[PDB]
Every structure is written in C-alpha cells, then in structure tokens.
Enzyme design. Structure first.
Site, PDB file in Angstrom:
ATOM      1  N   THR B  91       0.838  -1.171   0.000  1.00 36.97           N
ATOM      2  CA  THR B  91       0.000   0.000   0.000  1.00 36.97           C
ATOM      3  C   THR B  91       0.885   1.237   0.000  1.00 36.97           C
ATOM      4  O   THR B  91       0.767   2.076  -0.836  1.00 36.97           O
ATOM      5  CB  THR B  91      -0.990   0.024   1.187  1.00 36.97           C
ATOM      6  OG1 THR B  91      -0.607  -0.751   2.266  1.00 36.97           O
ATOM      7  CG2 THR B  91      -2.320  -0.607   0.691  1.00 36.97           C
ATOM      8  N   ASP B 394      -1.423 -12.790  11.928  1.00 40.37           N
ATOM      9  CA  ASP B 394      -0.640 -11.570  11.726  1.00 40.37           C
ATOM     10  C   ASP B 394       0.441 -11.419  12.685  1.00 40.37           C
ATOM     11  O   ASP B 394       1.529 -10.913  12.246  1.00 40.37           O
ATOM     12  CB  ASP B 394      -1.629 -10.425  11.794  1.00 40.37           C
ATOM     13  CG  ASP B 394      -2.621 -10.382  10.635  1.00 40.37           C
ATOM     14  OD1 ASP B 394      -2.321 -10.806   9.482  1.00 40.37           O
ATOM     15  OD2 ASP B 394      -3.724  -9.861  10.909  1.00 40.37           O
TER      16      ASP B 394
END
Lengths: 510, 534, 513
Positions: B91, B394
């Site tokens: 991103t 994660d």
C-alpha cells in the site's frame, strides 16, 4: 406569479429557502468573530482610508440587502449597540444560526407557527436560569482590576493581541466619574486618535482632547467658558478683483484697514463677554492673532468636522458662521483649560471635576489611523459595556463560556414538554453552539471535538476556548479564572433581541 | 492527452507530456492513500458494469485497472512486483513513488551530471538503511519486555475482537516454538503454517487451551463405529477406504451388469478383513485419509467397522511425521488381504480421546520423533474463531520475520517519520545539488504516516505535531529504550509507547520499501529518445 | 477504464442512489402499503410492494443499487422474509448520517458509531422479547398470523398456520440435537395442480411426487426401505461406441437399442431380488419405470443424494445396498403414516415423518392452479416464524413499535455517555425514527406530533409492549393487539443494513474498469 399585481420578492420557496441562506451570509462575518480571533475584515467605501473592524455595527450598515428578512436583523443589532457594548456580533450569529436550524424543521413536515412559538418559550427559560450563572461581580468601581476584567472581553473580540494593555487603560482613565446607577453619559467620553508613537504608548488624559495646535498665549483660568464658531474668520471683507490681482491699489489699503478694525471689535467682544478660550475652525490671520494676545485668549488654529461635533454635544454649544461680532451663548461646563502635549503635539486640554456631566478621554497614540480605527472598536465597546447602571454588574462567564451551559439545560427541558414546540426548543440549544463553532474554526479544529469535551466536563460555567494550542487538542480552557468575564446585561439583550428578530423574519412571505 | 496531437502514443513534447504523465501517476496513488495501513478502506471497482469486487489491498486494486500511459504502466507493475516479493509494503510503496518521480525529473534535468543526481537519492536510502540496521529500540521480540510473550500481547490488543492479549498472547509463543524445523534463510526461522490451529464451537467465548502434541479433528453424533479406544500407537494410511468405491467406477461400455455388481459385494467383505490385519500389528486406532459420502456414512456405522472418520488431511499429515509413521511405504493393493508394516505405525506417549467444548478430538500427547503443540481456540460459535485466528496469524508472521533479521525497526510509516529529520540534517550538511536530492527524498517520508492518520480520522495536523518533538538533534540516537519515541502505532493513528506491536514490521520489508519508491524515478527516466511509430 | 473522483463527491452519489429506492418501500412496509409502479421499456404494467423486483427488471446503478439487490437475495435464502426491510434500513442510515458528519469532517468516526449503535440495539431489543411456549399452539397462533396479514392476506391465513406450525418443528439437522433454525432445503414447499382446501392434508414430513405415479407401483407400506444402486440396480446407463461406422447400416440399429437394452438390465435386477422401493439419482424414465411396475415396486427418480439420505431417516429405514444386506439399524422407525391421493393419472406419495432432518415438503392446495402460487408464498412466510420461535422462544411484541423502541433508546444513551462518540451516535438514532413515522403518514394528521407521544411513552410506560401500530398511527398496547414482529427477521435485517451503509462510506473511488 399568476398575477400582474401583488408584488413580493419572498414567499413560497423563496421565504423558506432564500431568506435563510441570505441571513447565513451576513452572519458569516461573525462566525469568525466574537471572542478569541485573529480575523480582520477590510471594508472600503471611498473614505480615503482602509477601514478595519471586527464589529458588527460598521460591517452591517455598509452592506445593503434588498430583502426584508436579512435587513430587519441589522436594526436589532443596532438596538443592542445602544443599550450595551460588545455582544453585537453574538446577536446576529444567533438569529442567523437559529434560522438555519429552522429551515430543517420546515423540511420534515413541521409548521412555521409552532416553531415560532417554541423560541419564545426557550428564550424565557434561558433568561430565567441566566442570573443563576453569575459566578463573579464587582463591588467597587474605583478599583482598576474589577473593572478591567469586564473590559477585557470587549477588547478580546477585536484582537487577541491587545487584551492586556487596553483593559487596564480605560479603567485607569476612568469611565467611573459617573456613579453609573441611574445616569451615565457616553457622548462626554470619546475615543480620540493621536497620530504618532506606538499603541502601548496610548496614555491617560482627563477631559476633552482636541489634536489641533495651540497658538498665542495659553490660559489657566477658571473663567474660561467655551465659545465655538465653525468659521469666525475668512477675511471680514471678501475681495473682488478687477485687475485680476486686486481691485485695486487704493482699495487694497481700505480692505486691510477695515479687516483689522472689525476683527479688533469681534475679538474684543469675546474678551469682554467672559469667553477666554475660543475655538476657531476658521483661519488665524496675523491681525486676529495680534488681538487675542492682548485680551489673553487661548487660540485653537484649526478644527475639522469631527472636532466641532464633540464640542456641540459635550459643551451644549452651537457652531455659528461669523464675520460680524457675536457674544456668548455656547456656554460650557468646563472651568479649567490647560495645555498639555500628547504625542509631542500640542493638544488642548479641558477639564472640570464633578460626577455628573464630568468628562474623560481614552486617548490613543498609533502608527497609522487605520491601526487606531480597530483599537477604537475595542475601546468604544468597552465604554458601552460599562453601562449597566449598577455597581454590581452581576458578571456571568465571558467569552462564550456560558453558551454550552444554556445549551445543556435547554435540550433537557425540551424533552419534558410535548407537541411540536419542543423541536424548536432543542434547535434553540444548538444555536448557542454557534459560538463554540466559530471559536473552534479560528482555533484550527473541528466542531465535534470542542462541543463534546465541554459537555463531557458537565456543569462547569467556566469552559470556553481560545486561539491557542491549549485551545485545540484537549479543547479545555478556563474563562472564569482568566478574568474573562462579561456583564449579565450584555448577554441579556443579545439573546433577547436575537430571539425577537428570528421570530419576525421567519414569519415573512411578502 | 494535452498539448499538440501532431504526434501520438503519449508524445506531445516539451513541458505538456511530462505534466500529463505525473498527474496520472498521482491518481493511482490517491486510491491507495485511502486504502493505506491496517486501517485501510474498502473500494469498489466496477469491472464491466455487471460485476464488482471489493478490495482494500494496494497491489490488488491496481491490477484490475486499465493503464493507458507509460507512467501508469511502470507504477502498477512496481506494486505487483512488491506483491510477489512479500506482499507487505504494497500500500505504501505507490504513495512515496508518486511524489518522487515528479520531483526528480526536475532535479535530473537541472544536472551537473545525471548519474550524480540519481546517486543523491541513493545516498539518502544508504543512510536510511544503515539507520534501520542500527535500530533495536522498537519491534524487538527477542529482547522484548517479555520476549515473544509481550510481542504477541501488544499484537492482539491492536487487533482486538473481545479480550485478547490474555490467553491469546501465550498461543503465539507456543506455535513458533512447537516447530523444531529450522529453516536457514539467514538466522534460524520456523514456519507458522506447520502449526495446527483448530476451531471449536461451544463454551467460553475468549479462551484458548494448549495441547501437548498435534491433534486430529473429528466429531461423533451419528456414529456407532468404535474409534475411541485409548491406545498409544497410530497407523497412518494415506490410502482411501470406501465400502462402495475403492475398485469400482462407472463404466457404460460393458453390457453385462455382472462386473460392476460383483466387485461391489466383495468390497463390503474386504473392508472388514482389511481392518483386522492393520490392528493386529500394534494399533487400536487407525487414521485413514480418504473422505466419505453422506450415503456411505450409514454402511460404515452399521457394519461396526473400526475406523477414524470425518478426518482432516492436514491434521493427519502433521501427526504421521511427528509420530514417525509413514503414510505410504509398502501398500499397493486394494484387497483386504493387503500387506501392512510395523514401521507405518508411529509412536506417541498416549493416543487418548477427550471431548472438550462439544468437539470430539483424538489428541496425540507428546509426539515422538519430534515434539509439537496444537492450540485449539475456544469461542461460543465457529464464526468467533475465524476472527481470532486471522488476527493471531498476523502476530505469528511478524514474529517470524523478526527471527530472520536481528535488526528491527518500528515499521510502517514510523521509520519513515524518524528518517525525514535525519536525512534533512545530512542534506543541509552536504550542500550543492545533493542537498535537494536528499531533501526531496526526505519530505516524501514524512507524508506517509500523516496520510495513514487521515484514514483512521486522527488527522495529519495532530500526527506531525506530537511526533517531531520527541526527535531532536541530540536524540538522533538509535538506542534500545525509550527516551525519545520513534514508533507509531498505525491502528491507533497517534503515537503510543507500545514498542512491540504487530503493526510494526522489521528491517526486511522496510529496506525494500525505500528502494522500490526510488526505482520508480530512475526507471521512467531510463529512456533515451522519444518517438511515435505509425 | 480508470475514473477518479475523491471524498465527499463519491459519498453523495451513494445517497442519491439509495434513498430513491428506500422511500416507496418505506411506505410498503407495515400494515398499510403503496405500490411501486414500473413503466416498462416494452410497455405494460408490473407493480409490486417489493423494490428489488422492479430494480431487477430494469435500472441497475453502480453504488447502492447493486448492493441492495445482493444483500436482499441472501436475506430470502436465510429466514425468507425481511427482504423489504433491509433496503430501507440501509438507505435511511446512509441518508441522514453522512451529510452533517462530513461537513463537520469525520468519516471514520461515523463507521465506529455504527458499531456502537449495533451493540446497543441487540441488548435493549432482547430485553423486551417476551418468552412464549412452543408446546402451546394457541400462543404460536398469534405470532404466525401477523406474518400473513403483513402481505395483506387473511383468506389463506388460517390454512398456512395449520400446516406450518407442526411441520418445521420436526425438521432437525443432521447434528440431530437441533431443531432451531431449519433454513430452506431442510424445509420446502412444492405445489400440486388445482385442488381445494378439503384436498389439503397436514404433512409434517416430506412428499415425493415422482414416487408412486401409477396404480401398480407401491400402495401403502408404513415404513419403506429404499435401495441404493449397488447390487440390485447398477451405476451403468449409456451407449457403447466400441466400433462405429456411418457407412454401416446395422450401426444405426445397434446404437439405439444399446440404450434400451441397458435399462432392461438395470430393471431386471430389482425384479429378481424384490425391493419395495428403489432410488436412482441418475433419473429414469417412464419407459424404464414400466418394467418395475410388474414386480409392483415403486421407483423414485430425478432426485439427489442429499435428499435421499435425509429422506431415509424420515422413512424409517437406513441406506442398504440390496434387500439381502441387513445390518444394524441407523433409524428403525421414522414414518407414522403413508398416504397416496390422485389428481390426474399422477399419484402423489405423502409420507408423514416426525423428528428427522428430511426435506419437509409440505402439501398445499389453492382454489385453482393460479392460487397454488399465492398459497406457496404465504407458507414461505409462515415456516419462517416456526424457525424463529424454535430458535428463540423470546420474541418482540413489535409492530413498528420495535424500530421506534431502539431509536428512542439510543437518544437517551448519547446524552448520558457524553464523549466524542455522542454526535455520530445521535445521528443514527434519528435515521431509525424516520421509518415508523411514515407508517403514521398513511393513517393521517401531523405525523411528528403523534411520534412525540411515543417518545414520552417509551421512558414512562413501555418501549414496545405498549408501542405504536402503523394502522391506527396511535399507541396501542401491542401485546393485547396480537401484533408481534418475528425477532429473527429484525435481528438480521439490522445487522446487514449497518454493514452495507458502512461499505459505501468506506468507498471513495468508482472506476469503470
């Protein structure tokens, strides 16, 4: 229309929508105003200068609108200007805010007339809880700190850089000559601009200040009564000119002899009648000067329109055109006449000592006359807030710290009553919220954060916010204990007139 | 296009064509500014006008897009290339790149030498990388407050679905340490997909239980077969078993109904034969890979056949290795007289069946030939467990990456926020053309954590204000403890003092983020000559 | 290709699209209703009380419009009702929330307000839910009747009730301990031509209408055994192409009989062994069927494996390869009755079943062939309330009282909590209140004045036991009135709506590639 008669510019769609959007544009000049701000609005008008203001009265009169709805509120603002000082801005933002909130009500399916009714109710409840928001008050008016805290709020509304010096200065120079308990005069205090020097170099002088230089000898007698004439000299005889220079040589001899003997008589008539200070807005010739040195009269070279005006209001004077000898009738309440230099310019100083009809002057010193016009707004509002006509002015939290308190009480109260009225009552709370929004916009952060965190601390009656870094993120400042206080009377007329103004204009459709 | 159209294919010459390209480059980036972080926002990309996809990942968005310019083209590919690499930095990389390309064509053009102008950009990244290596102040999980226990705690608090960092911190510590396979890629590392993480619905909403050894998932509810005989030895059959089809298949070419029929009668008999022989060897529990039909379920139950079913292959696959069984090493028949081995048996301390929380499990306690652990999340629903798993994954990925590279940084835009000030002190110092080169490089680093802030609605203004203060001219230090802050939690979107969160990402991803943003400026520049081809 | 438009610009386009749909359906819901007329591109009239129908037949747009069609489809599959409800909730929330909180400037805070309104809503709405029994029919009678006359049917209300109530309860899943939700496929409805209500049977099991289709295929056996392929039929059914020539004449003859020959080999197996029912998932024909009928064995044909295994539990016998394989019983009993009624030359086999997963396809009969369709819709609404009650005996006594109940609930809390949350939370409070107000619009007078009496009534008396009905547009004790809204519909409708409104707020790019 359907008619070639019945003229309207408002009504139907245009009453509901167009009127409100116009009120909104006037009141955009006061969603950058009222309390902590750095806004400046420049307005020109061909006045040979730049006019800098953060006062509603001068902005409003300049600006003309062709609709009765927007035009009507300007009058309500002027009304609050006469009865009280600063809060003029607050009158217009309130009426204008309430009207934006109103239009949304109209949209849903609620009628105009109940909404109109519910404001009168909310205004009455807000005033009733208002003297219960008194947190601090004066008792002595001869004490400089108790007066200055009040003053401070007016000054603040202008610039947030000139609060400390001025608020002290006015109280120092007196607006406490009157008892302020039945009687107060505000045309026997002016704000007098002296060009030259810095604005922290603004000074205290007691009684009438006129800029114009003094000529001749100066008096210090108590028999000195003021005589005011706009033009008492122009040459006592006017020339015609036949050789396009003079008409002519033997005649020029006579024109000068007759001037000197007529001016002798005129200036001796002034001397005899008990007028020992003459204000000349005319021209001081050598002949006229020569006479006034002999009789012992203080002579004021020149005057402009502005200087003449203050003499006629204060003295009980008239300004007569003259070239044929007159006598006293202007009279005066001033005994003493002294001479003192303010700004390093010779200034004429009038004084007498009394309570009622006694005079004072907040006199200023400034780089330019523009810088002095804004300062003047701060100072003239500071004289007009003094007027309450009590010595316990019942000070309530200034700076918009009351506003959230009023809003909380009103929203709860709304819930209790039934029918359509209540929605107007709730809206009436969110109109006060206008003030916390404008302080937020200049502070640099959004509305959501300030209103919520003031509400979070519950009942406080201190909370308002500045221009600072303290004013942004935790959005909490003390404006009870910073000595930011305003008067009960100033907030009263502001809320009262604004509710009356919002109701009449919401009615129109013609 | 804009300018003259005297020539075509992205040629208009002069100032106009450069201006066109950089605006377009900026439009891609703006999409990805809003989708930036773990705070990223969903976009809708309409793919025809009867289709939609909802995405919030930076590289993915750009793939569906229609490039139609050279600047467009190089920038999507940069993002996708980064997606191939790790898929982290995806991103961010775009956003930095948009600013860089515009600034640089100006400065390379304003040459003394063009290789020198590009080298300044390199000089800024070389200090940055060096810094990044020197740092062990935030995101250290190996010299943490509580080592891997603290790292996991802060990760679960950042991605909280209930009360987490409690039971769930302990899980992260167990799963990495349950794999005893070292994968030497620079320092010893463990796979976090060699672990067995299981869902169980019923009882307490936010809980975990640690199991010693890997476990096989199954459920009893309409079975009458034995499979809960407590033993210590498992025979692991990769081999499918079905009573109906394990020799049979549909033929429509043979006219005779006999051939299909006869093999079917025989396949009910031989299943019964096949199981006894496996059991005799040493097992009393058998784990059989093949699946079963709902139609076939009734036969196994009725015959009374000893088999473990409603098995999960992935679970079974872990057990076979750890027990030391082999799934395949001598089988080659499909009769019930089939050979079986004593080495296709594996060993555990016990193979005991417990039913906990409304789910039946056969649990292999203390596996031998290597030791593991299996953590079974506990929710009040199956759905609750999906959320808890994804957040934990994660946590486990950030921990593994930390093992590979000792060196660590507070990752995201936080390393970036620090480096802006330092690469500016250095820019000034050097002077000349290089001062601009580093200084444009530097200001591009400050912008990313500010844009991220906006997304979580904490705003740019609030972010910069709090953060730059802690950095100082005598707090240029990397340390190993807080005296100046340098991290920046990215979910919070305002700087905290949690210095091991899983919103930090180590040196490995963050060095390649810097290099990919610079490369985009070099590359668009790399061309010599511009022509239109008719 | 790529199209770029950023922020609040994109977010208005979403409002614009959603609200236009939402408005008429906001009037269509309740016990008063409107019509959304389509003017078709081919002409002619189609008009419904359901917005999705009309969107589907024409008009699809990029943002909201496609989202409303997709969530509402998931809703039909689930409970089977409230398809109407979703779309209104999604559009009113996005309408009212977005504009005031964007000008202020805070999009992401608003997303967090939607959660805080989701959390509040579940807690408060569950407290007012009142337990009733599912062992007392007369209690379940009141709730199921409302669902019918929300479509404005009262003629076929009574018939729907008697079939649905018992039937859904017997549906289990293949966990077997539940009961609860019996989501469609484990409950179904299929219709039979013409009929009248004296030809209606209550059926708590499943019906197979491609079972006994002839008067020489199984009559009545209380519990059948269904025989799966294997060793009493075969898997084969096709033609052989071992060697083929178009040149050859005898090839054309060989190839066509090879289909028929194969079918006779299958059907001869059933004859020799004697089943009483055989199941084929491949699908036989009429002509294949014939050979089975002389042995007097019924065929079930054109089915699927999941249906035959559930149906085996129901019928009272497990899956066996052939009638000579008999081992331990998975179900030894399951069918209470076997009944067969003939309309035309097609016989329809009814088989009553209790407490098995099955498929539960219940009989229905309309007044005519056209009316079978309308009757089938009323049962889809009726079987929904049975899965609702069976899941949670607690359900709301709502009636539009329920939307209102939550709306006022949130306003109270926004004031108490204070904090930065209070303005976005107060915005959503109001969005919910737009909806019950529209119900009073149909009734008459100043809607908002009537709504105020509700507001005062919520704190003072009750939230929604004493609530408002949209047919009176005044306060009525909702419990005495016997208008009750199904809790299961209200729980799900409100969950999805927040999410679809939340998705659009997140979007600030629409590309067309």
């Amino acid at each position: 229309m359907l008619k070639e008669g019945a003229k309207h510019f408002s009504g139907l769609e245009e009453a509901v929508y167009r009127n409100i959007q116009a009120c909104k544009e006037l009141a955009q000049t006061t969603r950058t105003a009222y309390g902590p701000n750095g806004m400046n609005k420049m307005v020109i008008n061909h006045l040979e200068k730049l006019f800098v203001t953060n006062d509603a009265a001068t902005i409003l009169r300049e600006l003309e609108v062709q609709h009765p709805a927007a035009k009507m509120i300007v009058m309500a603002s002027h009304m609050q200007e006469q009865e009280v000082g600063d809060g003029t801005n607050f009158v217009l933002v309130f009426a204008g805010a309430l009207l934006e909130l109103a239009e949304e009500l109209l949209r849903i399916g609620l009628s105009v007339s109940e909404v109109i009714e519910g404001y009168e109710i909310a205004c009455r409840k807000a005033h009733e809880i208002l003297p219960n928001l008194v947190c601090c008050s004066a008792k002595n008016l001869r004490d400089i700190d108790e007066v200055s805290s009040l003053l401070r709020t007016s000054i603040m509304s202008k610039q947030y850089g000139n609060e400390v010096f001025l608020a002290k200065l006015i109280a120092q120079a007196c607006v406490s000559i009157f008892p302020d308990s039945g009687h107060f005069n505000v045309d026997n205090i002016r704000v007098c601009k002296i060009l030259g020097s810095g604005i922290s170099s603004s000074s205290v002088l007691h009684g009438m200040v006129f800029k114009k230089e003094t000529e001749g000898d100066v008096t210090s007698v108590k028999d000195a009564k003021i005589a005011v004439y706009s033009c008492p000299f122009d040459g006592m005889i006017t020339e015609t000119k036949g050789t396009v220079l003079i008409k002519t040589a033997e005649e020029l001899m006579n024109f000068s002899k007759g001037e000197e003997n007529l001016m002798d008589a005129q200036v001796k008539a002034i001397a005899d009648t008990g007028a020992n200070v003459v204000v000349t807005g005319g021209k001081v010739a050598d002949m006229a000067l020569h006479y006034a040195n002999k009789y012992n009269i203080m002579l004021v070279r020149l005057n402009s329109k502005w200087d003449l005006r203050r003499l006629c209001k204060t003295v009980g004077a008239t300004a007569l055109p003259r070239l044929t000898p007159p006598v006293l009738e202007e009279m005066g309440h001033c005994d003493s006449v002294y001479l003192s230099e303010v700004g390093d310019t010779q200034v004429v100083v009038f004084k007498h000592e009394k309570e009622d009809g006694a005079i004072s002057t907040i006199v200023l010193r400034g780089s330019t006359d523009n810088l002095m016009d804004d300062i003047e707004r701060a100072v003239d509002d500071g004289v007009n807030t003094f007027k309450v006509l009590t010595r316990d002015k019942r000070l309530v939290p200034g700076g918009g710290a009351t506003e959230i308190e009023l809003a909380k009480q009103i929203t709860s109260y709304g819930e209790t009553c039934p029918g359509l009225e209540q929605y107007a009552i709730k809206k009436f709370a969110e109109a006060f919220e206008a003030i916390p929004r404008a302080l937020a916009e200049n502070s640099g952060v959004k509305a959501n954060e300030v209103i919520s965190k003031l509400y979070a601390v519950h009942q406080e009656g201190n909370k308002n916010v500045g221009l600072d870094i303290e004013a942004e993120v935790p959005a909490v400042k003390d404006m009870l204990e910073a000595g930011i206080l305003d008067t009960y009377l100033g907030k009263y007329w502001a809320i009262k007139l604004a509710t009356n103004a919002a109701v009449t204009v919401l009615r129109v459709d013609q | 296009m804009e300018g003259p159209l005297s020539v075509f294919g992205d040629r208009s010459t002069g100032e106009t064509i450069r201006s066109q390209n950089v605006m377009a480059a900026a439009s891609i980036a703006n999409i990805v500014k809003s989708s930036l972080g773990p705070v990223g926002l969903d976009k809708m990309l309409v793919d025809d006008i009867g289709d939609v996809t909802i995405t919030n990942d930076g590289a993915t968005i750009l793939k569906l897009l229609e490039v139609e310019h050279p600047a467009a083209k190089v920038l999507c590919e940069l993002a996708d290339l980064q997606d191939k690499e790790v898929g982290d930095g995806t991103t961010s990389v775009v956003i930095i790149a948009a600013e860089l390309l515009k600034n640089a064509d100006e400065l390379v053009k304003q040459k003394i030498h063009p290789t020198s102008v590009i080298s300044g950009y390199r000089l800024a990244c070389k200090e940055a990388v060096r810094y990044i290596n020197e740092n062990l102040i935030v995101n250290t999980d190996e010299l943490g407050r509580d080592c891997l226990i603290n790292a996991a705690k802060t990760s679960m608090s950042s991605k909280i679905i209930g009360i987490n960092g409690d039971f769930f911190a302990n899980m992260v510590v167990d799963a990495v340490l349950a794999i005893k396979y070292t994968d030497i890629r620079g320092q010893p590392r463990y796979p976090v997909n060699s672990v067995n993480i299981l869902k169980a619905h019923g009882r307490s909403q936010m809980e975990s239980m640690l199991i010693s050894g890997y476990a096989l998932n199954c459920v009893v509810g309409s079975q009458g077969m034995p499979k809960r005989i407590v033993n210590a030895k498992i025979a692991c059959l990769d081999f499918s078993l079905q009573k109906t089809k394990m020799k049979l298949g549909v033929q429509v070419v043979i006219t005779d109904p006999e051939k299909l029929d006869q093999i079917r009668q025989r396949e009910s008999d031989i299943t019964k034969e096949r199981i006894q022989k496996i059991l005799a060897t040493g097992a009393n529990v058998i784990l059989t890979t093949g699946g079963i039909d709902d139609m076939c379920l009734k036969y196994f139950v009725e015959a009374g056949a000893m088999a473990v079913r409603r098995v999960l292959k992935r679970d079974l696959k872990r057990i076979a290795k750890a027990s030391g069984a082999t799934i395949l090493s001598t089988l080659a028949n499909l009769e019930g007289e089939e050979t079986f081995e004593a080495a296709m048996l594996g060993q555990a301390e016990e193979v005991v069946q417990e039913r906990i929380c409304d789910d039946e499990l056969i649990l292999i306690k203390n596996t031998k030939a290597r030791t593991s652990a299996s953590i079974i999340l506990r929710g009040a629903n199956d759905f609750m467990c999906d959320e808890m798993e994804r957040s934990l994954h994660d946590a486990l990925c950030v921990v593994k990456r930390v093992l590979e590279s000792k060196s660590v940084v507070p990752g995201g835009g936080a390393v970036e926020a620090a480096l802006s000030i330092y690469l500016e002190n250095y820019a000034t110092s050097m002077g000349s053309r290089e001062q601009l080169a580093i200084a444009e490089f530097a200001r591009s680093l400050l912008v990313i954590p500010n844009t991220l802030a906006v997304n979580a609605a904490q705003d740019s203004t609030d972010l910069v204000a709090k953060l730059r203060a802690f950095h100082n001219e005598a707090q240029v230090n990397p340390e190993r403890k807080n005296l100046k802050w340098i991290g920046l939690d990215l979910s919070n979107g305002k700087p905290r003092d949690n210095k091991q969160a899983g919103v930090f990402e180590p040196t490995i991803v963050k060095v390649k983020s810097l290099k990919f943003a610079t490369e985009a400026a070099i590359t668009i520049l790399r061309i010599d000559d511009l022509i239109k081809l008719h | 290709n790529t199209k770029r438009e950023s922020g609040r610009k994109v977010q208005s386009g979403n409002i614009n699209a959603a609200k236009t749909i939402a408005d008429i359906i906001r009037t269509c819901l309740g016990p008063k209703s409107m019509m959304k007329m389509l003017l078709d591109p081919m002409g002619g009239i189609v008009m419904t009380n359901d917005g999705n129908a009309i969107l589907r037949e024409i008009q699809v747009q990029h943002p909201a419009a496609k989202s409303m069609i997709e969530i509402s489809r998931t809703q039909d599959e689930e409970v089977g009702d409230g398809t109407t409800s979703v779309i209104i909730l999604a559009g009113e929330m996005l309408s009212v929330a977005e504009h005031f909180l964007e000008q202020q400037m805070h999009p992401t805070v608003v997303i967090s307000a939607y959660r805080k309104a989701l959390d509040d809503m579940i807690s408060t709405l569950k407290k007012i839910s009142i337990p009733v029994d599912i062992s007392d029919s007369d209690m379940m009678l009141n709730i199921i009747n409302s669902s019918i006359t929300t479509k404005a049917i009262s003629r076929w209300s009574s018939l729907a009730c008697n079939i649905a109530l018992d039937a859904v309860k017997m549906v289990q899943f293949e966990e077997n301990g539940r009961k609860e939700i019996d989501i469609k496929k484990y409950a179904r409805v299929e219709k039979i031509p013409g009929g009248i209500i004296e030809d209606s049977c209550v059926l708590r099991g499943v019906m197979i209408n491609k079972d006994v289709t002839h008067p020489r295929m199984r009559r009545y056996i209380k519990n059948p055994r269904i025989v799966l392929l294997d060793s009493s039929l075969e898997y084969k059914k096709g033609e052989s192409q071992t060697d083929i020539e178009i040149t050859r004449e005898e090839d054309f003859t060989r190839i066509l009989q090879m289909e028929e020959e194969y079918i006779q080999q299958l059907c001869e197996d059933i004859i020799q062994l004697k089943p009483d029912v055989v199941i084929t998932e491949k699908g036989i024909s009429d002509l294949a069927q014939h050979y089975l009928m002389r042995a007097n064995i019924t065929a079930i044909r054109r089915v699927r494996k999941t249906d035959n295994n559930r149906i085996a539990r129901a019928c009272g016998a497990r899956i066996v390869s052939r009638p000579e394989e008999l081992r331990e019983d998975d179900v030894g009993t399951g069918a209470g009755l076997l009944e067969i009624k003939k309309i035309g030359d097609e016989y329809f086999t009814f088989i009553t079943d209790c407490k098995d997963p099955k498929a539960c396809t219940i009989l229905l009969r309309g007044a005519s062939k056209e009316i079978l369709s309308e009757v089938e819709r009323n049962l889809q609404d009726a079987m929904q309330v049975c899965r609702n009650v069976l899941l949670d005996p607690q359900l709301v006594p709502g009636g539009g009282a329920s939307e209102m109940a939550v709306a006022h609930a949130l306003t109270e809390k926004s004031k108490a909590m204070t904090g930065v949350e209070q303005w976005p939370y107060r915005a959503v409070a109001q969005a919910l209140e737009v909806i019950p107000r529209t119900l009073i619009q149909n009734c008459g007078a100043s809607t908002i004045r009537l709504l105020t009496s509700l507001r005062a009534k919520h704190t003072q008396e009750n939230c929604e036991t004493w609530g408002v009905n949209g047919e009176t547009g005044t306060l009525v004790d909702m419990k005495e009135l016997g208008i009750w809204e199904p809790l299961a519909v209200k729980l799900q409708t409100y969950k999805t709506a927040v999410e679809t409104a939340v998705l659009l707020l997140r979007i600030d790019d629409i590309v067309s590639g």
